[PDB]
Amino acid sequence: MAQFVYTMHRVGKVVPPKRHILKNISLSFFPGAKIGVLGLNGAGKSTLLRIMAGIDKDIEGEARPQPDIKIGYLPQEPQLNPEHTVRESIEEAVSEVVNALKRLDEVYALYADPDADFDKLAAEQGRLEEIIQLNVQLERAADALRLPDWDAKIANLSGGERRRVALCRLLLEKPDMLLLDEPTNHLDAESVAWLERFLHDFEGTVVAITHDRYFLDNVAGWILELDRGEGIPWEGNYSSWLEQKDQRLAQEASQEAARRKSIEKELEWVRQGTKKGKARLARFEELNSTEYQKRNETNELFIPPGPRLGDKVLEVSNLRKSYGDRLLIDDLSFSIPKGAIVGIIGPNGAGKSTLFRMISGQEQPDSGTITLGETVKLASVDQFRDSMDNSKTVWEEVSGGLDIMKIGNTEMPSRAYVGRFNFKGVDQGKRVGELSGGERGRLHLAKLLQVGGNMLLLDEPTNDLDIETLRALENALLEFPGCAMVISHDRWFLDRIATHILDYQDEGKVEFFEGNFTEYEEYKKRTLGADALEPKRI
Amino acid sequence: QFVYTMHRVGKVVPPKRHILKNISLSFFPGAKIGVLGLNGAGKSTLLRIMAGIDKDIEGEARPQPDIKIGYLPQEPQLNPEHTVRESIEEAVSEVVNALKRLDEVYALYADPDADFDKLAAEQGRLEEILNVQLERAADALRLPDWDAKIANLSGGERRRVALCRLLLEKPDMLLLDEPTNHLDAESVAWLERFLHDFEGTVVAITHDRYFLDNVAGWILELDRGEGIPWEGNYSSWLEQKDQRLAQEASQEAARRKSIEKELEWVRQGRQSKGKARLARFEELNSTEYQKRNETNELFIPPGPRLGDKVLEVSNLRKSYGDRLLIDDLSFSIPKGAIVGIIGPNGAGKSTLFRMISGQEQPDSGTITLGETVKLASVDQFRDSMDNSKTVWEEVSGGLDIMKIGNTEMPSRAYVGRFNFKGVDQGKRVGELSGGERGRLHLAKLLQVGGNMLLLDEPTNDLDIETLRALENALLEFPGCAMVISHDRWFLDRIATHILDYQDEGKVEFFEGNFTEYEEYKKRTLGA
């Protein structure tokens, strides 16, 4: 099990009250790897090294070092024996070799005893000489790190003097793995350069918490960033990490901008700047511009344009439909202008969804006529969000595995089309079952609008959406070149986009009106008198 | 005065995750509160706690005694064997029980042993305590027929029944988790009016913007399991949210600009560029030029314009006790020079600054400053005699207006120019990281607006974003700097000269940065 010098599985650390300084840390460490540990103060960098040291065992998950290796650890604040001298503290580091020399003098002294076994002496002496690979080395190391005099008490030493001693011991022990917490503190520039050289040529594994960018750029072959107490391994040095950090910031800036834009659209409406269909039908041609729609592609939600709509879209004449013994619609007539967004309201079971199924040709009227224009291509999106297999992902659900989809008449990357429904790269592998009813609503929308129709029949797309999606949807629809008919009980949504209203009343009565929800209610009140808006059913 | 209070309320969910943490909120009678947040922010848990259902929590969650709370969860809980009528009747059972008692009283008049007074008195209390209110209610929410069995109702119908029940109960406080689900438009408008006219407290989790804009006078937004109350309706909240995204956008652009400056240097490898920095001396000293740097992550006060005569050191000798620190040092510093200072500790690095500052005196030789030179010394210590003070207090001394250099300016603005944002400014010195204390120390001592900065190890404990920001700010500084530092990247980026303190009082002066010096050192001395 030497393939990894250290492993962590779901490692965490809780500090009272219940704060986690680290969470879900799953990482593998390779022998010889040189890793720089980055992260803001409080990201748990130091705790992480204490765990690898074997000092902190009170953790979640499992933290295992390679078996039978030497681990050296440098805390931020050195731990030395105030009574020892510098000489003695350093000599503790080379105990392994000092003990060899002592044993070797014994072996040599054993040669003079007639009961000694030559072969065993010579063999052990050989095994002792094999280990050696001193007083001059210590002097050499001592100079390198500017150590205080050999005779100095640890007590008398400064904090920086103690650090240099602790550092020198560690390097002289030559462990398999060096764990370094801010090793450049209290050192001078040429010493740091010397340290970098040592760390660079060091044959074992180095995990260093440091701000020193020459370390990170010239030694570090991996950057381990700690953020929310979670680990972000990055393969490469400081420079390439820095480039990655920049792109990540540019992405973040891009995502908030897209969404600051969505919010500002609603703000204009709110300010207010009204009083979008007294204007919508007039500027229809402006929406049908190819260059114009190409700019809306970076909007939070972007609905694909259908084929160009003609003047005649939907003509319904004396429409009549019943279900069982219940009259749903009687004598309904209307024409839908191109560009119109028609909000549909009324009590459930009034036959609202039934109209869609009839325009769609899934059901037949009992009487009357429904006529669509020859340029009309329907996109129906029913109210259900139910998945037969909620183990599939957002992207699998929409694409069916296709990398390239024909969205309407146009081929395009499925990833891009999915992204145009505010499903970011990181969200596309989320399973359907893992999504919120809101998100299940965006997905249902994303899946079914792939047909690229210029006439959208949306049955309650708004029922379960969160505010940001509702706003993005409103905005997307205000930009959509074709027609939409939307069954909804969201009044703000209706007032923002609707050019017309179909109002289902009891006994098969259906009222058609030009305006939004609020305009309709006032008109209904104005004509039916007060108590008109007060709902009434059983 | 409070209908409900919460003190440090939090909730922990497997494995160890915190769905709510540190929730301390007071609720007011009649207040109408809209509850917002992303999925998983703990919205529903919050209402469950206030409902008195979830009782396994941290902190203290307590209703006003005697307060009647009606709670609507996302999924209706109704006995499937009762009729709609029966379910509805349960909400008005107190009124119904009175009607039954009333008829007993009416009958009791005919008995001769009955006390008339008590009957009339009890009758009167029964008028304290109108049946049609049910029809109107069932109408308004469009309930299914009275005879309908709940088991036969759909999800929506059951929600209409459960909601109708709740509003008929006339509680003091309504806690509604997504009440508009599966209603029709006009039904929701009716619900809006009801909750608007409702005299008690309403706490509602909804997405309905007309609710949030017309009814709610407060918006309670949950994010990381923490709550941000906002006083105002949806529209004012939206406006505030926009401004928060503008702020976030600008803080990242500042950070992103700092990164892109260092990216430029990295992508080259480079040279000392002292000639570049000398050629730009005029450009750097332009007042309109420096005005653009004010929005940088770190902004150093420009200082007065440096003349040609800056610093001239000649035959400088200094010892401390028996130990020589400096022997026979000579150098002059051209304007705009940034001098990196290196060497082993105790070699006399800080001592040069104390001599330039005039705190200490040279044993031999001279140090001459030009007339235009104004020092700013920043020592290596981060000690505070009272770590209980905030960042702003430590820098400003409580002054709203500070004289920075020769310029009066808001102290909050000055502090912000050292990357202490508003929320950071109230942090106690003791709460700050070592790197933050070093940024505090700089901000504090640079307030003098010197054109010659004597910086003793400002880089020692700083984090990477700060180091990078500091380098960037030094590259924009119109004046001179001498910086003792053991950060070689920092020195390579900004140093135009190097002072290298060696043993026995030897000090070497070189034009170029650290890497250039070292390569030179290896050329004349060897490895």
Curated annotation (Swiss-Prot), chain A:
It catalyses: ATP + H2O = ADP + phosphate + H(+). ATP 1 binds at G39, L40, N41, G42, A43, G44, K45, S46. GO terms for cellular component: cytoplasm. Residues 95-133 are annotated as: Arm. Its main location: cytoplasm. Its EC number is 3.6.1.-. Induction: Constitutively expressed, increases in stationary phase (at protein level). The keyword Cytoplasm applies. Residues 6-253, 314-538 form the ABC transporter domain. One of its GO terms (biological process) is negative regulation of translational elongation. It is an enzyme of class 3 (hydrolase). SMART domains: AAA. Disruption phenotype: Not essential it can be disrupted, its absence impairs fitness in long-term (up to 6 days) growth in stationary phase. Belongs to the ABC transporter superfamily. ABCF family. Translational throttle EttA subfamily. Monomer at concentrations found in vivo, exists in a slowly reversible monomer-homodimer equilibrium. Probably contacts ribosomal proteins L1, L5, L33 and S7, the 16S and 23S rRNA and the P-site containing tRNA(fMet). A translation factor that gates the progression of the 70S ribosomal initiation complex (IC, containing tRNA(fMet) in the P-site) into the translation elongation cycle by using a mechanism sensitive to the ATP/ADP ratio. Binds to the 70S ribosome E-site where it modulates the state of the translating ribosome during subunit translocation. This is Energy-dependent translational throttle protein EttA. It comes from Escherichia coli (strain K12).
From Swiss-Prot, chain B:
Induction: Constitutively expressed, increases in stationary phase (at protein level). InterPro entries: AAA+_ATPase, ABC_tran_Xtn, ABC_transporter-like_ATP-bd, ABC_transporter-like_CS, EttA, P-loop_NTPase. Changing E457Q: Arrests growth, inhibits tripeptide but not dipeptide formation, stably binds 70S ribosomes, probably locked in an ATP-bound form as it should not have ATPase activity, 47-fold decrease in translation. Residues 93-129 are annotated as: Arm. Residues 232-309 are annotated as: PtIM. It is found in: Cytoplasm. GO terms for cellular component: cytoplasm. Its EC number is 3.6.1.-. GO terms for biological process: negative regulation of translational elongation; translation. This is Energy-dependent translational throttle protein EttA. It comes from Escherichia coli (strain K12). The gene is ettA.
